[PDB]
Amino acid sequence: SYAKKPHISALNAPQLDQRYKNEFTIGAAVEPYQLQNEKDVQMLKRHFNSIVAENVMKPISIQPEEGKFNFEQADRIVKFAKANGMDIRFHTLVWHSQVPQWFFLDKEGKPMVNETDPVKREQNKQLLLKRLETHIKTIVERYKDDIKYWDVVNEVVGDDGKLRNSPWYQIAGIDYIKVAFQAARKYGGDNIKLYMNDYNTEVEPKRTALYNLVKQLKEEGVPIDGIGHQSHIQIGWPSEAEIEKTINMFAALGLDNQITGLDVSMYGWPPRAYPTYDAIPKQKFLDQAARYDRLFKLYEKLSDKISNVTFWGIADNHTWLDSRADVYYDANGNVVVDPNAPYAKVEKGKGKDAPFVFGPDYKVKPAYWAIIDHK
Ligand SMILES: O[C@@H]1[C@@H](O)[C@H](O[C@@H]2CO[C@@H](O[C@@H]3CO[C@@H](O[C@@H]4CO[C@@H](O[C@@H]5CO[C@@H](O[C@@H]6CO[C@H](F)[C@H](O)[C@H]6O)[C@H](O)[C@H]5O)[C@H](O)[C@H]4O)[C@H](O)[C@H]3O)[C@H](O)[C@H]2O)OC[C@H]1O
Ligand SMILES: [Cl-]
Ligand SMILES: [Cl-]
Ligand SMILES: [Zn+2]
Ligand SMILES: [Zn+2]
Ligand SMILES: [Zn+2]
Ligand SMILES: [Zn+2]
Numbered sequence: 001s002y003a004k005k006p007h008i009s010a011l012n013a014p015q016l017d018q019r020y021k022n023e024f025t026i027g028a029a030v031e032p033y034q035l036q037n038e039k040d041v042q043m044l045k046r047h048f049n050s051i052v053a054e055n056v057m058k059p060i061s062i063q064p065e066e067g068k069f070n071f072e073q074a075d076r077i078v079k080f081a082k083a084n085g086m087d088i089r090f091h092t093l094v095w096h097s098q099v100p101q102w103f104f105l106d107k108e109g110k111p112m113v114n115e116t117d118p119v120k121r122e123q124n125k126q127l128l129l130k131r132l133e134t135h136i137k138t139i140v141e142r143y144k145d146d147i148k149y150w151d152v153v154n155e156v157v158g159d160d161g162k163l164r165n166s167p168w169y170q171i172a173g174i175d176y177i178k179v180a181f182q183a184a185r186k187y188g189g190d191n192i193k194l195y196m197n198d199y200n201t202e203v204e205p206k207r208t209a210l211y212n213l214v215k216q217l218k219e220e221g222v223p224i225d226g227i228g229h230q231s232h233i234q235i236g237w238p239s240e241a242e243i244e245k246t247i248n249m250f251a252a253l254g255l256d257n258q259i260t261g262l263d264v265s266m267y268g269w270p271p272r273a274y275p276t277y278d279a280i281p282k283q284k285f286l287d288q289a290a291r292y293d294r295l296f297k298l299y300e301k302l303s304d305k306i307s308n309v310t311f312w313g314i315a316d317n318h319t320w321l322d323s324r325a326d327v328y329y330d331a332n333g334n335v336v337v338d339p340n341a342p343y344a345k346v347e348k349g350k351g352k353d354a355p356f357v358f359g360p361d362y363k364v365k366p367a368y369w370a371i372i373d374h375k
C-alpha cells in the first residue's frame with residue numbers, strides 16, 4: 001500500500017490479472033479508439049484478461065434504427081479480445097439510457113406511453129416485446145460463441161426500491177425483464193451467463209428490492225445466473241461491511257457476482273472536483289490507496305463468490321467520472337471542494353477525477369501497490 005513504492009510505468013509493472021488469476025478475472029471497459037492507441041493496447045495486453053465495451057454495445061449503438069445493425073465497432077472489441085485470450089462481457093442488451101426511441105413508438109408513430117386504450121396498450125406491449133426479442137436474437141446469434149458474460153438488463157430497479165418506471169416498464173410491465181432473459185437463453189444456449197446489472201446494489205431499499213426481484217424471477221424459471229455490481233463508489237462509501245453483506249446476500253441465492261464498472265472516485269456526491277489532475281493533493285491518492293487495499297482484500301475474501309472484477313476504464317486519462325466532475329468556484333474565483341462551503345458558480349463536468357490504479361501518464365499509483373501486494 002506503500003507510498004515508498006515507485007511511480008513506475010505500468011508497462012514495467014507486475015501484471016494485475018496474473019496477481020488475481022485464481023481469485024477472479026480483471027477487466028477493463030474500452031472504446032474502439034483505444035485499440036488504436038499503442039499505450040492502451042499495451043495496458044490491455046499486460047494487465048487485463050477480461051474486456052467490456054464502454055459504449056459501442058449499448059442498444060442505441062447496435063440498432064439505432066429498426067433493422068439497421070451496426071456491429072462494426074463491437075466486432076473490433078470482440079476481435080481484439082479473442083486475439084488476446086480475454087473474456088468478453090456484453091454491456092448491455094436492455095437499458096433505459098442510450099436506447100433508441102423507435103422501440104417505444106406505436107404503429108402510428110406516437111409514443112406508446114401515451115396510449116389510453118387498454119386493448120391498444122396490450123397490442124403495444126406485444127409489439128415492444130417482439131422488438132425486444134428481435135434485438136436480443138440478432139445480437140446473441142452473432143456473438144454467442146465468443147461472449148461468455150451478458151448484462152441482459154441494466155438498472156431495472158429504482159433507487160426508491162420500486163421497479164424503475166422506464167418506458168420498458170410503463171409499456172410492458174415486468175415481462176420485459178423476463179422476455180429479455182428468456183430470449184438471451186433461447187438464442188445463446190446454456191453456456192452463456194446472464195446477469196442483471198445495477199449501481200448502488202449495496203444501498204437499501206434498492207438492495208432488498210433487487211434481491212426480491214431476482215429471487216422471484218428465478219422461482220418463476222427465468223434464467224438469471226448472476227448480479228453485476230457496477231460499483232461506482234467513493235473512498236468512504238459504501239462501507240466494506242455493506243459491500244460484503246451485499247455480495248453474500250446474492251451468493252446465497254445461488255448467483256454469481258461480478259464487479260462490472262469499478263471506479264473509486266476522489267469525491268463525494270454531488271462531487272466537488274478539482275479542476276485538473278495536477279491540483280488533486282497527494283493525500284487523496286493515499287486515502288484512495290487504503291480504500292483499494294481494503295476493497296481488494298474483501299474481494300479476495302469473497303473470491304469464491306466473485307468471478308470477475310472489471311474497472312470502468314484503463315487509466316486515469318480517460319474516465320466517464322470526468323463528466324460528473326463539477327468544479328465549484330467562490331466569489332473570488334477560487335476552487336471550492338469542501339462539500340458544504342460557500343460558492344458562487346459551478347462549472348459542470350469540467351474537472352478531473354482519478355479513479356483507477358494507473359495514472360494518466362500510465363504510471364502506477366499508490367493504489368496499484370496497495371492491490372498488487374499480499375498484505
Ligand atoms: O462514456 C460514458 C459511459 O462511460 C457511461 O457508462 C455508464 C456509466 O455507469 C452506468 O450509469 C450510471 C451509474 O451511476 C449512477 O450515478 C449514481 C447515482 O447515485 C449516487 O448515489 C449516492 C452516492 O452518495 C451517497 O451519499 C454518501 C453517503 O455516505 C457518505 F456520507 C458520502 O460522503 C456520501 O457521498 C448517496 O446516499 C447515494 O444516493 C451514486 O454516487 C452515483 O454513482 C448514474 O445515475 C448512472 O447513469 C452505466 O451502466 C454505464 O453504461 O455511459 C455514458 C457515456 O457517456
Ligand atoms: Cl467516458
Ligand atoms: Cl501522475
Ligand atoms: Zn494476462
Ligand atoms: Zn454492463
Ligand atoms: Zn495538467
Ligand atoms: Zn469513455
Ligand SMILES: [Zn+2]
Nearest residue numbers: 007359361363
Ligand atoms: Zn505521473
Ligand SMILES: [Zn+2]
Nearest residue numbers: 293370371375
Ligand atoms: Zn493490499
